[PDB]
Amino acid sequence: TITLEKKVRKGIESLITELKLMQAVLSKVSKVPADQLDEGVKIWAGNVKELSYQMEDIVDAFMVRVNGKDLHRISAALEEVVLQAKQLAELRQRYEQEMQTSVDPRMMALYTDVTELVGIEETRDKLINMLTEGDDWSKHPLKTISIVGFGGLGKTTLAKAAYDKIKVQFDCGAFVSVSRNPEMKKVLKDILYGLDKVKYENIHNAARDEKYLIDDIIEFLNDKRYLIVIDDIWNEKAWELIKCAFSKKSPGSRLITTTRNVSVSEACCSSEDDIYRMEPLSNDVSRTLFCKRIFSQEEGCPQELLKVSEEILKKCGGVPLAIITIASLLANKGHIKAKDEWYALLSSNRSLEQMKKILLFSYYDLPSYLKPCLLYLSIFPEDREIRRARLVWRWISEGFVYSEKQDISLYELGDSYFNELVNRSMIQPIGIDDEGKVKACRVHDMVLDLICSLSSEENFVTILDDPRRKMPNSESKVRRLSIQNSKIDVDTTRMEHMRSVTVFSDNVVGKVLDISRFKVLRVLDLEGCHVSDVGYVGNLLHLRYLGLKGTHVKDLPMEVGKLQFLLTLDLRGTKIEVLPWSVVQLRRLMCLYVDYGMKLPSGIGNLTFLEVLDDLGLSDVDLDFVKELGRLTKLRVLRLDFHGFDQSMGKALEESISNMYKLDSLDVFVNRGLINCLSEHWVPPPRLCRLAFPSKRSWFKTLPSWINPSSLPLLSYLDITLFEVRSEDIQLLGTLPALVYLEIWNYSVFEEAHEVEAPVLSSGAALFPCATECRFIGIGAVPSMFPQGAAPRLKRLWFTFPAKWSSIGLGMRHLPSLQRVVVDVISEGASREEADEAEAALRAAAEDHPNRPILDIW
Amino acid sequence: VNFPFPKKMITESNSKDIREYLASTFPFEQQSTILDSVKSIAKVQIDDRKAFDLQLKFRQENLAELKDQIILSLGANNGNQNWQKLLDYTNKLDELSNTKISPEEFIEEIQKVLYKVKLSTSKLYSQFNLSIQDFALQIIHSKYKSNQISQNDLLKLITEDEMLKILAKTKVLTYKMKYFDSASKMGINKYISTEMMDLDWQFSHYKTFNDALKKNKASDSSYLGWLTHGYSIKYGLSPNNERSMFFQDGRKYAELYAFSKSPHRKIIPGEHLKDLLAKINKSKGIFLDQNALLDKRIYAFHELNTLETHFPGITSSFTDDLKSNYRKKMESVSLTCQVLQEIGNIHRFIESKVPYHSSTEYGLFSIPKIFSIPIDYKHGEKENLVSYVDFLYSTAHERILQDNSINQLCLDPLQESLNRIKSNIPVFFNL
Ligand SMILES: Nc1ncnc2c1ncn2[C@@H]1O[C@H](COP(=O)(O)OP(=O)(O)OP(=O)(O)O)[C@@H](O)[C@H]1O
C-alpha cells in the first residue's frame, strides 16, 4: 500500500503542473474579441475548460480526504482524466489546417448633426467657465481639466462642443484620440498634423523616434496659446510620456482629457477641483430625447404606451447611448411596434451589436485575475444592492483570491480587488460600512444583461427563473446554481459536481430541494430563507462558507467539528442561544459573525487566524476566557458588549487587547454608568484607525490620556461621550494628524442640569487639518473655535447656541469650504424677543458666506 | 342579531348618581374611569387616606393568608422545594411591613430580599415567588406614600439598573398570571396593551412610580417603557412568531435615545437609523392594509403605539400621513383597548353578584376573604350598572372613526362585547 501512496503523490504533482499550463493557455485565449477567434480554437478552449474543472476536483478530493477505498477511487479517477486529456490532444491535432480590420464604432458619432443633442447648453457653459474663469485667464499658468464616467455617457461629445465653441480665442489647437493599445509615434504624429496641416502635411510618413517628434512639438508651440484635447486615455504610461511635450511654461494655454478610469484623472489634474464628473440626464430630458427620437414630429405619446415607456426609461438609467439604441429598436422606421411587443422587449440588429461591442471594452481590459470576480455578479437579482463583505468572503471561498507572498492577508487582497472594480467605473458604490469602508454596490441593468449572457455561454452560472432562463436544454454538468423563482421544481440528480448553491426566495418551496446529495460543496448560502433546521451540514467535508443569516435555525448539530476547512460562519438573526462545544475544533476559521446574546464555549483561544470577530458576549465569563482572548494575534476587527461583564477585571482585558498588534477597528458598547476599562497607561495598538463608543449614556471621565497624537498617529474616526468637556480638550484633538471624522457628546448637559459653556481655542493655527465633519453635540461656538482660519476642509458643522448669548460674532468667512450647518437653540433663559433676534442674526451670518450653506435651527 | 348602540348625551343629573355610586362601591373607588374625560361629570369628593389604610389592611390580610397556605404547603410537598425559605421571606416581609424603622435599614433589607429572590420545579411555587416580589414592592409604594421615605432616596432606589429590570418583569408577569384566562374567556386578550396596564386598582402602585420618573428623569421613564414592552413580547402576550426588529436588542435603545436628544439625526441618518426607519415604514404599511390578517395588524399597532408614546415624533412623516390619515386611527384603537379593559373589569365585577361565588374571580390573593365583597344587591346597583355600560358605549361611539378599512379592529370588538354583555346581564340579574 506504500506504492499506492507514492504513485498517487506523483500523479497529483503532475496534475498541478498541467493545471498551471492550462490556465496560462485559457487566459491567453480569453483576450481576443469574439470577432477574431476562429471556431476551432473556441471549441477546443471550451473542452479544455471542462477538463480543468475535473482535475481541480480530483486534486481537492485528495487534499481533503488524506484509506484503501479512497486511494482506489482517486487512482481510478486519475487514470480516467489522464486518458481524456490525451484523447482531446490527439483530436485537436487531427483537424488543424493553417490555410481586414474594422473601424472603431465610436468614430461615426463625431459626425452626428448638432441639432440632435438635447441638453448640452448647461454643461457646455459650465465647462467653458471652468476653462476661462475670469478676465485675465489669458495670463495664468497652464491648466488641465479631466472628464470621467462610464461608457456611453457623452464625454467626447461635450468636449467637442466646448472645443468648437471657444477655439477662436487661441492660436493653435488639436483633437486627438488615444485608443486602448496605443503606438506613441502615431499619437505624436497626429498632434503634429493637427497643429498645422500644411507644414507637417506628410508627417505620417517620417521615420524618427519619439525624442525628435517631441522636440518638434516643443519647438512649434513656442510663444503661442494653445487648446488641446486628448481623448480616451486608458492607463498611466501613455499620459506619462505625452506630458513631456507640454513641459515648458506657457501662460494662457489649456488641456482637456477624457477617460473612463479614475486614477488616471487624478494623475492628470493637479487639484481635485479640476475634475469634472459626468452624470446622467434627468428624467424630463431623457423623455424628450426619447420622444424626439421616435415620435419625432408628433412628440405625443399615446396613453397605452405611457407606463411601458416609463419602465423602459427607468431601465435605461439616463445614459444617452442606451436611450438612443432602444429608441431606434422600437422606432422600426417603417412602423411603430405594438404595445404587447413593447412589453416583450421590456421583459427581455446593428445598433444593438454596436452598443454591446462598445460596452465590452471595459471587460476586455481587465487583468486576467479579475474577470471571474466580475462574472460572479451575475448570481444576484436585478435591481437590489449587494453587501461587499458577502462578496469578498464568497470570492475567497470559491478560490479566486490567492498569492504566494508569505505575509499577506487574503481579506485585504479581496478588498483591493473590489476597490479596483469600483475604480474602473463598472460598479456604483453606496453607503459607508460600520468599519469605515463601502457598504454596498449597484450595477447598471444593460451591464447586467451583458454579464449574464457572457457567464451563461460558459456554464459559469445557471439561473432559475420560470418565465425566462429555464434549465439548459442539453447540459449534464452544472457547477453553480442560483434559485430566484421558487415556482420551478429541480431535478438535482444529475448535478453531482455542484460547487455553490444560493436561494433568493422567501418561499417555502425553496427549502424543498434536497441538499445532502451534493457531496462536494464549497458555498452554501441560505440568507433570508425560512429553513428551520439543518442536521445534514455535517457529512459535507468540503464547505468553506456557511451562510445562515435571518433564518429560523434553533440549534446546530454537534458535528460541525468535522469541517476542518471552513473560512466563514455567519449566524445573525437566528434563534440560537448556545453554540456547540465542538466549534472550538475548527482550526482554519477566519470570520465569525454572532449576536451578543449567544454563549461561546470555553477553549476559544485555539481559533488562531481569526481576522474578524463580531459582537462578543462578555457576560458570565471567568478570567481564563479574557486571558485566552489575548492569543488571537492577527485580528483586525473587534466588537464587545460589556453587558453582564463584571467591571473588576478590565485590566486583563486591556492587556489582552494591547497584545493585538495588527488591528483597525474597535467598538465598546456599555449600557450605563462610568466605563471602568481602558485605563491610562494602556499603550494602544499602533495601527488603530477607527474607534467608537456608541453608548451615548455611559460617559468617560475627563479624557483618556492616551489620545495624544504620538500614540495614535493614524486615526480617521472618533466618537466619544464625555462627562464634562473642558476648553483644552478640543486642543488635544487639534493635535491629531488625520482625524477625518469626529463626534463628541457632553453627558452633563443632557442627563445632569449643567448649562452650555463656551469653549475657547487658542495658541495655534492649522488646528484641524483634514477635518471634513465635526459634531460638537452639547457644546457650540463658531468664531472662537476657529481662529486665523483653521480646518480649511470642514463641510458640515453641528453646534449648540443658547439664546442668552444674543449679545461673539457668527462670521463664517474663517472657513472657506462650509456647505452645511445644523444648529439648535436653547430658549428658556432668554425671551422670544432675543430668540428670533438671534435666529435672524445667524441666518444673515450664513447668507453672507459665498458658498451659502444651509441652516437648521431645530 | 346585533343589539343597537345606546345613543345618550351625558347629563350631570345621572352623572351625580353614577359618580357617588363609583365613589361608594369598593372596586370602583381606587380605579379611575374614561368618563372623567367627559365635559361635565365633575364633583368627585374623594379622599385617599381611607383608601390608603384600606390598602394597608388588604396587604396585611393577604400576606397573612399566603403565609397560612405556606405552612400547609410545606407540610405535604411533592419534592421538597425549601418552602421554609419562602416562609422566611414572608417573615421578613411582615417584619418590615409592621414596624417603623430608619429609611436606610428599610433600603438595605428591601434590596437584600429583592436581589436574592432574583435567582422551576412547581408552577404555583413560582406564583408564590412572584407574589412575594409584588407584595414587597407594594410595601415600598405604601411606605413612600406613608411619608416615611423621601423622594431623593426613592429615586436612588428605583433608578438603579436592577430595580428597573425587575419592575417590568413583575408588572407584566403578574398581570398575565392574574388576568390571562379571564381575557381569553372574554375574548379580548388580543387587545391587551402594556400602555394601559397601570389603570387597574391592582396595579396602581406602579403608576405612582411611573409619574415619579415623569417627575424627575424622563429618560428613565421612556427606558422603562421600552423595557416593559420587550418583556411583554418575550413572555408571549403578543406572539409575532418570527422575531422583533427593535425591542429585545440593547443597541436599539441607544439609537432611539440619540435621536431623542438631537432630532436632526433623522434627516441625515446613519445605517442603524436607516434600517430602523425602513422597518418602521414596513410595519406601518402592514398596519394600513385591510385584508391582511388581524393579528399582524394588531401587533403592528402595538409596536407603533409604544414607539410613538415613548419616543415622540419618530414615526411621523409629514406628507403621506394625510393621505393615509392613520393618526386618528391609532387614537381610535387606543380608545377601544381602554374601553374593552373597563368592560372586562365590569364583567369580572358581575361575578361578585353571584349568590355562590365565595371564590375570587380576579386571581390569587386579589381579595382577602375578610372583606369578600358580598352578594347584597343594593338599591342603586341594578340601575347604575346598566346606565354605566350604556354611557360607556355612548361615549365610545362618538370619537371612533367609521371606515371599513379601520372598522375591522375597533367596531366589531365593541359590537361583539355589547352583544355578550347585553345577553348575559339579564340572566345574572335574575339570579
Ligand atoms: N446630450 C445628448 N443628446 C443626444 N445624444 C447624446 C448626448 N450626449 C451623448 N449623446 C450620444 O451618445 C453617444 C455616445 O456618446 P459619447 O461616445 O460621446 O460618450 P463617451 O463618453 O465618448 O463614450 P466612451 O467613454 O465609450 O468614449 C453618441 O452617439 C452621442 O450621439
PDB file of C-alpha atoms in Angstrom, chain A residues 464-467 483-490 505 507 509-510:
ATOM      1  CA  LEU A 464     -33.517  29.542 -12.447  1.00  0.00           C
ATOM      2  CA  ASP A 465     -36.452  31.760 -13.367  1.00  0.00           C
ATOM      3  CA  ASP A 466     -39.687  30.357 -14.714  1.00  0.00           C
ATOM      4  CA  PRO A 467     -40.674  32.894 -17.438  1.00  0.00           C
ATOM      5  CA  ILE A 483     -32.594  29.876  -7.456  1.00  0.00           C
ATOM      6  CA  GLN A 484     -34.689  33.018  -7.906  1.00  0.00           C
ATOM      7  CA  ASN A 485     -38.218  31.823  -8.755  1.00  0.00           C
ATOM      8  CA  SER A 486     -39.350  29.085  -6.392  1.00  0.00           C
ATOM      9  CA  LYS A 487     -42.196  28.093  -8.752  1.00  0.00           C
ATOM     10  CA  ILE A 488     -39.884  25.748 -10.676  1.00  0.00           C
ATOM     11  CA  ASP A 489     -39.039  22.255  -9.471  1.00  0.00           C
ATOM     12  CA  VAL A 490     -35.486  20.946  -9.682  1.00  0.00           C
ATOM     13  CA  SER A 505     -36.763  33.044  -2.413  1.00  0.00           C
ATOM     14  CA  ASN A 507     -40.849  30.845  -0.478  1.00  0.00           C
ATOM     15  CA  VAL A 509     -40.862  25.565  -1.846  1.00  0.00           C
ATOM     16  CA  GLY A 510     -37.340  26.994  -1.803  1.00  0.00           C
TER      17      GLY A 510
END
